[PDB]
């Protein structure tokens, strides 16, 4: 599982792989590693699918419910505290991109629960293979179109280069005003 996301000139742009695997044989032609925690904040987890569907469910509802309970748009860092606190109680990395009162923030979250704000990120088997191409071409304040093409490039590289990663891609531009998803980037 590659998952790559990167900040542009006003919006985070996340992109991720779409192919589950049992370890030997593939067990799915497709999956959703771009869950929608809220209109202007999403998570892209990598790891065991089970744990991921779990904590993303519990997260989505903690955040949507808390948003119902208060005026403020659930600003991106609260999701990071909730998630990291949950993982800290105890195997699933995440990469979450949202836009808010601050900048288009993007975070990466380690399996032990560690958090970091990041300019651009990847996780999973493809991470290495994504750190290679991603870092080389990155520039702060890219035109969002540059995000549109790049993140697909680093994803495709982190696809072709791993046995454990493959299949069609999907990408989204989390503007603060709106998410703009597309089901198959490919």
């Amino acid at each position: 599982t590659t998952i790559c996301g990167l900040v542009c000139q006003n919006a985070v742009i996340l992109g991720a792989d779409t192919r589950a695997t049992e370890g030997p044989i593939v067990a799915d032609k497709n999956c959703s590693k771009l869950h929608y925690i809220s209109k202007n904040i999403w998570c892209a987890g990598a790891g065991v699918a089970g744990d991921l569907e779990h904590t993303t469910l519990w997260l989505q509802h903690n955040v949507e419910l808390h948003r119902l309970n208060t005026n403020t748009q659930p600003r991106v860092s609260m999701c990071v505290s909730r998630l990291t606190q949950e993982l800290f109680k105890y195997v699933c990395a995440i990469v979450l991109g949202g836009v808010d009162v601050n900048g288009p923030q993007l975070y990466g979250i380690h399996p032990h629960g560690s958090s970091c704000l990041l300019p651009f990120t990847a996780l999973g088997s493809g991470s290495l293979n994504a750190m290679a191409v991603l870092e080389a071409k990155y520039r702060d304040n890219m035109t969002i179109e540059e995000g549109k093409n790049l993140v697909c490039e680093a994803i495709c590289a982190g696809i072709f280069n791993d046995l454990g990663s493959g299949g069609n891609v999907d990408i989204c531009v989390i503007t603060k005003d709106s998410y703009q998803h597309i089901r198959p980037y490919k």
Binding site: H66, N69, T70, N71, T72, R75, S77, M78, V80, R82
Partner: protein
């Protein structure tokens, strides 16, 4: 009997709640909390060998938040300690400081649970709450021993209440720190004192300086 306990009337109207409000309304420590344009003032009269230097109603419960309190004093120190507990748990859980109303969900709900549950007595204290919101608009709320997140552009509490609503209206027709604080200190004069603004540092909530008490009072 219905009066001896927190239960409904034959008329369907709760009693002991009204009595707790008499506790506040006979506490006789009036306090005017008016919002200012891009700021907000909260004032109270500070009322022997006793120390006026100690006395206050105003109290902060985070840097951004300060809540004047009136009523039975022990309940006040308790509701303040509860308030601080509340903001600390929210910050700890979520990494954001509470919006003033978010602190009023805790203040007003904790103050509420007393009302149904017959045992523990209804809350005997009330007061304003002020703080800069995530929205840049300053936020001034209130609460009642009966649950109320309220909501105001201006408020008064204590022995005086809606008596001074019409009095406040005259400032409301004229409602910067100069311009707003004078409305408050006058509103004490209109019907020493201790003044408290969030706009010192525009987000940090601090009681205004002692040396600068007089200059508004003499202007």
């Amino acid at each position: 009997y219905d009066r001896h306990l927190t239960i409904f009337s034959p008329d369907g109207n709760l009693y002991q709640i009204e009595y707790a409000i008499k506790a506040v309304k006979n506490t006789n420590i009036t306090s005017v909390g008016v919002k200012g344009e891009n700021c907000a003032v909260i004032i109270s009269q500070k009322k022997k060998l006793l120390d006026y230097n100690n006395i206050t109603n105003i109290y902060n419960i985070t840097d951004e938040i300060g809540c004047s309190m009136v009523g039975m004093p022990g309940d006040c120190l308790s509701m303040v300690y509860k308030a601080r507990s509340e903001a600390s748990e929210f910050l700890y859980s979520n990494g954001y400081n509470v919006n003033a109303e978010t602190l009023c969900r805790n203040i007003c709900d904790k103050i509420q649970v007393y009302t149904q549950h017959a045992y523990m007595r209804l809350h005997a204290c009330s007061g304003m709450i002020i703080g800069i919101d995530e929205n840049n608009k300053p936020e001034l709320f209130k609460f009642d021993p009966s649950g109320f997140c309220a909501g105001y552009r201006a408020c008064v509490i204590g022995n005086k209440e809606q008596e001074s609503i019409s009095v406040l209206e005259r400032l409301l027709e004229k409602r910067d720190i100069r311009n707003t604080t004078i409305l408050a200190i006058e509103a004490l004069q209109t019907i020493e004192i201790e003044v408290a603004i969030v706009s010192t540092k525009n987000r940090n909530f601090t009681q205004i300086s002692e040396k600068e008490i007089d200059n508004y009072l003499t202007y």
